[PDB]
Amino acid sequence: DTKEQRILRYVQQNAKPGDPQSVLEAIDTYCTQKEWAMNVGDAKGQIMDAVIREYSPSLVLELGAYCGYSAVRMARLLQPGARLLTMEINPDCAAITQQMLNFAGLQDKVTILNGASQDLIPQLKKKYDVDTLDMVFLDHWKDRYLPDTLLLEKCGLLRKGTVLLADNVIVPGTPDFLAYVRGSSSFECTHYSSYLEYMKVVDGLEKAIYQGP
Numbered sequence: 001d002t003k004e005q006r007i008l009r010y011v012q013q014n015a016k017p018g019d020p021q022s023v024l025e026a027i028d029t030y031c032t033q034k035e036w037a038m039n040v041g042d043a044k045g046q047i048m049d050a051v052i053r054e055y056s057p058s059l060v061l062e063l064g065a066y067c068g069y070s071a072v073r074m075a076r077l078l079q080p081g082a083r084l085l086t087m088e089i090n091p092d093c094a095a096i097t098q099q100m101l102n103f104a105g106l107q108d109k110v111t112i113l114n115g116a117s118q119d120l121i122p123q124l125k126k127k128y129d130v131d132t133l134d135m136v137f138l139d140h141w142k143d144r145y146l147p148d149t150l151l152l153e154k155c156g157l158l159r160k161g162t163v164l165l166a167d168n169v170i171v172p173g174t175p176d177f178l179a180y181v182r183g184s185s186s187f188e189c190t191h192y193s194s195y196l197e198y199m200k201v202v203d204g205l206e207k208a209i210y211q212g213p
């Protein structure tokens, strides 16, 4: 079996069905005590929680689902009728994510979109009936953060006040993305210093609020 299957089995055996907080705690335990994994984790997760509660987004797009940790984390804080769309290129991860969601009881709030973000983003309006996004969580691959931000803008998916929250802007690091949003008058940026999931390694999130074209 894979690490991802091991994480899911651990949650199923150590968490309470329908209790998102116990799912997150189980994942964080497994990944602290047994096998590191690239979930956003509790340190950065606490910052995401604070952001989600501040903005109360009706529609969130996540880029990169993996095992569903961040999806669970965000979806548990969404208001009734709010939705999360999560894009995931790896079908094995998608299948783990869907089971993680189902176990947490959040399946009604979250839709997994299977494919590359660069292929799916342009389908959001016509295929998935999206108008504009309230929040985007970028946590996929570092080299996609800037191109996908530009593509979201081109596709008309950002509106004044859309919140972009980017993981791993320090490690692995997203220097082109940071230089771009920080230098652009189309984004108002804040850096949130934290730590790499499960490790004593400085990392951080960037919040970039879209200000219109």
Ligand SMILES: Nc1ncnc2c1ncn2[C@@H]1O[C@H](CSCC[C@H](N)C(=O)O)[C@@H](O)[C@H]1O
Pocket (backbone or CB within 6 Å): 038, 039, 040, 041, 063, 064, 065, 066, 067, 068, 069, 070, 071, 087, 088, 089, 090, 093, 115, 116, 117, 118, 139, 140, 141, 144
């Ligand atoms: N271009 C792309 N489109 C969609 N998903 C992608 C992608 N490039 C990488 N991915 C996916 O991005 C994920 C990064 S790890 C995501 C962790 C998750 N956000 C969490 O915090 O719990 C991986 O599962 C990987 O397969």
Ligand SMILES: COCc1ccccc1-c1cc(O)c2[nH]cnc(=O)c2c1
Pocket (backbone or CB within 6 Å): 038, 039, 040, 064, 139, 140, 141, 142, 167, 168, 171, 172, 196, 197
């Ligand atoms: C594949 O590298 C794993 C890794 C190794 C060392 C340090 C950081 C990471 C890391 C951490 C993350 O939160 C990540 N989140 C999303 N996509 C990632 O590729 C990613 C990578």
Ligand SMILES: [Cl-]
Pocket (backbone or CB within 6 Å): 040, 041, 042, 043, 044, 196, 197, 198, 199
């Ligand atoms: Cl952590």
Ligand SMILES: [K+]
Pocket (backbone or CB within 6 Å): 055, 056, 057, 058
């Ligand atoms: K709202």
Ligand SMILES: [K+]
Pocket (backbone or CB within 6 Å): 181, 182, 183, 184, 185, 186, 187, 188, 189
């Ligand atoms: K700026």
Ligand SMILES: [Mg+2]
Pocket (backbone or CB within 6 Å): 038, 039, 040, 139, 167, 168
């Ligand atoms: Mg990450």
